[PDB]
Amino acid sequence: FRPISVFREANEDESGFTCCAFSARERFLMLGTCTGQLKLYNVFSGQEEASYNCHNSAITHLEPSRDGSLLLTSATWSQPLSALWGMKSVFDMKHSFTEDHYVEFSKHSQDRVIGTKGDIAHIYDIQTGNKLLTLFNPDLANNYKRNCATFNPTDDLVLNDGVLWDVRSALAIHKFDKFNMNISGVFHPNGLEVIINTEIWDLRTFHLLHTVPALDQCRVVFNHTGTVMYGAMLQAMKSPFGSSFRTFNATDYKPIATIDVKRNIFDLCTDTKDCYLAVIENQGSMDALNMDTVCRLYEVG
Ligand SMILES: CC(C)(Cc1ccccc1)c1cc2ccccc2c2nccn12
Numbered sequence: 099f100r101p102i103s104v105f106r107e108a109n110e111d112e113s114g115f116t117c118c119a120f121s122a123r124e125r126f127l128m129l130g131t132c133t134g135q136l137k138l139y140n141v142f143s144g145q146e147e148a149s150y151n152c153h154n155s156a157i158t159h160l161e162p163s164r165d166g167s168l169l170l171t172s173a174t175w176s177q178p179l180s181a182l183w184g185m186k187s188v189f190d191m192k193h194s195f196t197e198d199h200y201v202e203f204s205k206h207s208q209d210r211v212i213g214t215k216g217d218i219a220h221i222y223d224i225q226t227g228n229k230l231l232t233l234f235n236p237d238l239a240n241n242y243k244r245n246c247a248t249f250n251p252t253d254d255l256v257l258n259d260g261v262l263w264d265v266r267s268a269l270a271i272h273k274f275d276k277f278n279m280n281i282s283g284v285f286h287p288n289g290l291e292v293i294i295n296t297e298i299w300d301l302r303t304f305h306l307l308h309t310v311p312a313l314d315q316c317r318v319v320f321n322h323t324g325t326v327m328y329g330a331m332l333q334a335m336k337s338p339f340g341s342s343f344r345t346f347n348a349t350d351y352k353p354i355a356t357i358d359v360k361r362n363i364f365d366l367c368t369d370t371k372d373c374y375l376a377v378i379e380n381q382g383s384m385d386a387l388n389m390d391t392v393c394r395l396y397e398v399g
Pocket residue numbers: 128136137138147148149150185186187188189
């Protein structure tokens with residue numbers, strides 16, 4: 099991991115970056131802020147290119163669509179909590195998702211949104227904004243504190259609160275046992291495995307494939323080719339993560355690197371060519387009057 103660039107928020111006594119994702123335009127990173135702005139930066143010069151006030155509370159998550167035309171955001175206490183934005187010509191709001199505190203696109207065909215409200219997942223149509231499905235079974239809930247509902251790479255399975263759902267049937271297929279308080283899991287991009295905290299489960303057999311202790315309390319991100327997995331660990335404006343991230347081979351789950359950047363991490367993401375890792379790092383503690391985050395770009399890569 100060679101450092102390539104660093105920048106702080108412009109136009110600001112203190113720097114309030116909270117989350118990031120590369121745009122569909124190469125060289126440009128999208129970042130959310132603690133005042134609910136979405137900004138576009140040149141990742142090498144550190145130049146702010148554009149700004150929009152998406153929310154009147156801190157941005158906690160964003161996801162751009164692959165084709166460049168849409169963006170999801172989630173805020174902190176604002177109503178609506180999550181929204182979908184169009185970014186063709188004029189930046190505008192298309193839909194909002196009133197009490198969903200987290201939202202993702204579908205993966206194969208990005209025509210749906212999946213939102214999380216506590217233990218409950220909601221699936222929405224992008225065009226109409228309509229709620230198509232609610233996935234929730236009170237007998238199967240794990241009540242994970244950092245529940246994030248997510249589609250599998252083919253958009254036909256959902257993981258919500260440690261429960262595997264079939265989207266077409268709207269039926270729970272399997273409940274994975276609860277082995278931690280917080281992390282609910284993701285799908286591996288191979289379509290065959292799920293990573294729930296320290297457990298890797300096979301989707302065809304439900305056997306345990308691997309135990310990876312170093313994934314405890316880690317938010318997992320994959321690079322775009324699906325060969326490397328990045329883990330940032332939840333903290334014991336408070337940072338969501340501690341100051342180290344871990345990388346693993348995505349095919350055999352063997353450790354590649356432990357990087358302690360010595361600053362609490364707010365977010366990390368890779369570009370679509372997997373040359374770079376962008377990391378939001380806090381120069382301040384949570385005791386500071388104000389936030390002072392930087393975006394650091396590392397070549398992996
Ligand atoms: C859609 C567009 C006009 C594109 C554009 C405009 C100027 C420079 C580069 C790209 C635009 C995009 C955007 C993306 C993220 C955060 C804010 C904005 C934003 N705020 C008002 C304008 N925009």
